[PDB]
Amino acid sequence: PLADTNLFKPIKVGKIELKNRLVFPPTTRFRNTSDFVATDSMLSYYSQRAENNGGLLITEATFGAPQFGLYQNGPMIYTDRQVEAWKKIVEEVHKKGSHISMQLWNLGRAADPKLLKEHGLPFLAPSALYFSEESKKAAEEAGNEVQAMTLEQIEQTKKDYVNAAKNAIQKAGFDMVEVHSAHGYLLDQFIQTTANKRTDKYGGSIENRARLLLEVIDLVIEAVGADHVAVRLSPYATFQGSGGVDAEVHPIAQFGYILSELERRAKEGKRLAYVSIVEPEDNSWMLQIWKGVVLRSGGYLSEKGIAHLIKDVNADDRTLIGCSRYFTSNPDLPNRLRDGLPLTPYDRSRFYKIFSNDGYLTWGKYGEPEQPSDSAIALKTPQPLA
Amino acid sequence: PLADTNLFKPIKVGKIELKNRLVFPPTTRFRNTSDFVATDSMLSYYSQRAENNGGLLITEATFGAPQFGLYQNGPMIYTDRQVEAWKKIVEEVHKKGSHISMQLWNLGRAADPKLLKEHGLPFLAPSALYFSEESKKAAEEAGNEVQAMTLEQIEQTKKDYVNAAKNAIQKAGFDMVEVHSAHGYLLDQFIQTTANKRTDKYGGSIENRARLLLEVIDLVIEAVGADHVAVRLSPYATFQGSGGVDAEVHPIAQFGYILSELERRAKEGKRLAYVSIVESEDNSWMLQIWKGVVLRSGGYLSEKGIAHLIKDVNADDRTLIGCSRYFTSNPDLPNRLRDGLPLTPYDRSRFYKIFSNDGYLTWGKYGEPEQPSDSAIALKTPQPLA
Numbered sequence: 001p002l003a004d005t006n007l008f009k010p011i012k013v014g015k016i017e018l019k020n021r022l023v024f025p026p027t028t029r030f031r032n033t034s035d036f037v038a039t040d041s042m043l044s045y046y047s048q049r050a051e052n053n054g055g056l057l058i059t060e061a062t063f064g065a066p067q068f069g070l071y072q073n074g075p076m077i078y079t080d081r082q083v084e085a086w087k088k089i090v091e092e093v094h095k096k097g098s099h100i101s102m103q104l105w106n107l108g109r110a111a112d113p114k115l116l117k118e119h120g121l122p123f124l125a126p127s128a129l130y131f132s133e134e135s136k137k138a139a140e141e142a143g144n145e146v147q148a149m150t151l152e153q154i155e156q157t158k159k160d161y162v163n164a165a166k167n168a169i170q171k172a173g174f175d176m177v178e179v180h181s182a183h184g185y186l187l188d189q190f191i192q193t194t195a196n197k198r199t200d201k202y203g204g205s206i207e208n209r210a211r212l213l214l215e216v217i218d219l220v221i222e223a224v225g226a227d228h229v230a231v232r233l234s235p236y237a238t239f240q241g242s243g244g245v246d247a248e249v250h251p252i253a254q255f256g257y258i259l260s261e262l263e264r265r266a267k268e269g270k271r272l273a274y275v276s277i278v279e280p281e282d283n284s285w286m287l288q289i290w291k292g293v294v295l296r297s298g299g300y301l302s303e304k305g306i307a308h309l310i311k312d313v314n315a316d317d318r319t320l321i322g323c324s325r326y327f328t329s330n331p332d333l334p335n336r337l338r339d340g341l342p343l344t345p346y347d348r349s350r351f352y353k354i355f356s357n358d359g360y361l362t363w364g365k366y367g368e369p370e371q372p373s374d375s376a377i378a379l380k381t382p383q384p385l386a
Numbered sequence: 387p388l389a390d391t392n393l394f395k396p397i398k399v400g401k402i403e404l405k406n407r408l409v410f411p412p413t414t415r416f417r418n419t420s421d422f423v424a425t426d427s428m429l430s431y432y433s434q435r436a437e438n439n440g441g442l443l444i445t446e447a448t449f450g451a452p453q454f455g456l457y458q459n460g461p462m463i464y465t466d467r468q469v470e471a472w473k474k475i476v477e478e479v480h481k482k483g484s485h486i487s488m489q490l491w492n493l494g495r496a497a498d499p500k501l502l503k504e505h506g507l508p509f510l511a512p513s514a515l516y517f518s519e520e521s522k523k524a525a526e527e528a529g530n531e532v533q534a535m536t537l538e539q540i541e542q543t544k545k546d547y548v549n550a551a552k553n554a555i556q557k558a559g560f561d562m563v564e565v566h567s568a569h570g571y572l573l574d575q576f577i578q579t580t581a582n583k584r585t586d587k588y589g590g591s592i593e594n595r596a597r598l599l600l601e602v603i604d605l606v607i608e609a610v611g612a613d614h615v616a617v618r619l620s621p622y623a624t625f626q627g628s629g630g631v632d633a634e635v636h637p638i639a640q641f642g643y644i645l646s647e648l649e650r651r652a653k654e655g656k657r658l659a660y661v662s663i664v665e666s667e668d669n670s671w672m673l674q675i676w677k678g679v680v681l682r683s684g685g686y687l688s689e690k691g692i693a694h695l696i697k698d699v700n701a702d703d704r705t706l707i708g709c710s711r712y713f714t715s716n717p718d719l720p721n722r723l724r725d726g727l728p729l730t731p732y733d734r735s736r737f738y739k740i741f742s743n744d745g746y747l748t749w750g751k752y753g754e755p756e757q758p759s760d761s762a763i764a765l766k767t768p769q770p771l772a
């Protein structure tokens with residue numbers, strides 16, 4: 001039972017008032033159309049998690065533009081249809097009494113090179129380096145080999161971030177827009193020494209490696225306001241060739257500088273809505289630098305993560321707790337954690353089941369059974385919302 | 387009783403085998419002659435602190451050269467008489483079975499401008515900034531105003547560090563030489579954004595502000611070897627205008643970069659003898675970055691620090707514990723801490739009493755009385771060891 005704790009104490013984030021501090025972190029599921037349009041399945045998916053919640057939801061990582069991708073059946077906030085669909089999802093989430101932020105995705109050297117090629121797009125990264133020999137062979141066989149971004153492509157990346165942020169906040173009505181700068185995707189690639197060998201002002205130092213992220217953040221803040229902006233960082237992660245603690249420059253220095261710059265912008269009157277961090281190594285130093293709302297995610301609902309949930313959410317008055325994997329299998333997770341009711345185990349084998357309701361909408365509420373793989377919803381084909 | 391803890395477990399530091407991990411941190415006392423030569427009182431002082439100890443003694447912050455000073459009756463390892471006196475002290479310390487390091491001092495904008503003036507020396511800093519209006523005042527009346535160092539004064543500084551290091555290690559026989567890069571003196575002034583406004587290679591970035599320290603470190607490494615070199619850092623200190631956590635760039639990023647670079651030199655086969663550190667402020671990130679011997683100092687004997695002493699010294703097998711203020715009172719502090727014997731209180735009013743044995747050699751070992759100020763030892767005028 002966690003109703004006793006700060007986890008269900010209201011908190012002001014940005015300009016909105018969250019009823020609790022439990023967050024659904026961005027969780028990629030690939031239930032969009034092949035056109036990258038949000039579906040009715042996704043609408044019900046976020047609707048059930050906005051019901052009886054009052055808290056914050058964060059969308060699956062969403063491509064800001066075609067060049068920001070691509071993965072098959074991923075999300076996008078680019079075309080008119082996509083913005084319409086996401087707008088309807090937002091309107092339903094708000095009707096439910098919850099709030100929602102959209103995380104913006106940019107793959108970089110992590111993208112599907114064949115799909116990008118079929119959409120006539122190059123395969124871009126800070127430097128012409130692959131994170132694995134597997135990816136190198138994949139890009140070479142697709143005829144779409146990785147390229148170091150030109151200055152023009154970086155400028156276009158910034159403009160695309162601005163356009164996607166405006167579409168999310170102003171057209172679709174999201175409460176925040178979250179810049180995905182973690183897990184070895186494009187912005188992280190610019191941050192990481194392992195991925196960034198550039199010798200212009202976007203590489204070669206801590207300030208230079210963090211430059212693209214900070215410029216995107218500044219342009220987006222100018223576009224939609226700091227209280228509608230967020231960012232996610234993963235200093236210790238080694239996913240997709242990121243250096244973690246093994247980087248030639250320690251992540252405490254690099255990401256320490258990033259956090260210092262965000263806190264400086266906050267000291268100049270541009271305070272981000274929140275900074276999202278992944279629990280491992282210890283994140284305490286991060287909380288030393290950033291003084292605003294911090295969303296901490298990872299492990300908190302395991303058979304040992306509990307009582308670090310209590311400790312961390314009660315440690316101060318600015319901490320949000322994110323639970324992703326159990327939120328996928330528990331659409332009523334806020335009430336189950338509120339009342340201390342047993343959780344439904346999550347099923348990793350259906351995390352990325354492309355364009356299928358099986359393991360996506362088959363989960364029941366507390367005390368209700370899991371619908372089987374041959375049920376009506378499990379075999380119903382998702383339909384685009386616009 | 388602390389004999390059971392790691393505080394009294396042997397440990398290898400550099401080439402040296404320390405029988406315990408209690409350390410006498412560098413403690414300025416100003417009992418040298420007016421021409422900065424070590425003194426017989428100092429020999430008896432360090433000698434008493436070397437008996438029944440076997441630990442590491444760290445010498446009072448010592449001027450590497452006349453330009454590195456100046457303070458009244460401060461120490462220096464520049465002239466042949468000075469090196470010979472310090473050699474006598476080192477021979478006595480080794481004879482008594484303990485080991486000793488010399489900390490090298492460079493005042494910069496913290497110096498006495500009147501004294502420097504009287505020695506025909508300028509008043510140097512990274513930038514033409516005083517740490518206080520009082521210092522500005524004393525400098526302007528002595529007609530020795532602060533000057534931003536030229537490139538050749540920087541080069542001469544590094545050469546002087548090399549010369550002082552070779553003097554201490556190879557001639558005087560010190561076990562290691564510690565570079566003072568803390569508490570707002572010259573190297574810290576280069577590190578701090580509050581004091582370093584340089585636009586050249588030595589300022590305007592994390593890497594640029596740390597450049598002089600790392601260059602000096604590398605040169606001294608080349609001179610005397612890595613296991614004969616150490617460094618002290620005070621990321622949180624705000625002494626003499628240092629920025630602390632209020633710096634434009636957070637000290638976790640800056641000193642995080644410094645520690646990452648030192649650990650990088652360790653990865654390449656040049657592992658410093660130890661890193662000396664001072665102390666939501668918390669030095670845990672420092673231990674996340676630096677993996678070698680770390681000497682932690684500050685406040686460890688308050689009956690609120692005894693627990694932090696046991697905790698920090700037992701947390702791993704590479705932690706030394708420094709105790710300065712109580713070591714000034716208890717020349718047999720190793721035995722007292724080893725057997726839980728009550729400590730003689732310290733007298734700050736005689737910490738900096740110039741050229742006097744009173745409150746310097748009047749301390750008795752456990753079970754003996756403090757000699758009064760009219761005793762034979764207290765009235766003696768100290769003589770140079772030359």
Ligand SMILES: Cc1cc2nc3c(=O)[nH]c(=O)nc-3n(C[C@H](O)[C@H](O)[C@H](O)COP(=O)(O)O)c2cc1C
Binds near residue numbers: 029232298325352
């Ligand atoms: C299937 C799946 C998809 C995810 N997608 C994203 C994503 O798109 N963006 C992101 O920042 N994190 C993503 N994550 C990481 C989660 O947001 C979260 O940080 C991680 O699962 C740890 O939290 P947890 O222990 O509560 O599950 C994903 C995780 C999973 C399991």
Ligand SMILES: Cc1cc2nc3c(=O)[nH]c(=O)nc-3n(C[C@H](O)[C@H](O)[C@H](O)COP(=O)(O)O)c2cc1C
Binds near residue numbers: 413446489708710738
């Ligand atoms: C009188 C006095 C002189 C000191 N001189 C130096 C010095 O020359 N160099 C230095 O790095 N620290 C110096 N320190 C700081 C100590 O080395 C130590 O970090 C500080 O006193 C905290 O340790 P403690 O709590 O055990 O006393 C001095 C401290 C005192 C009280």
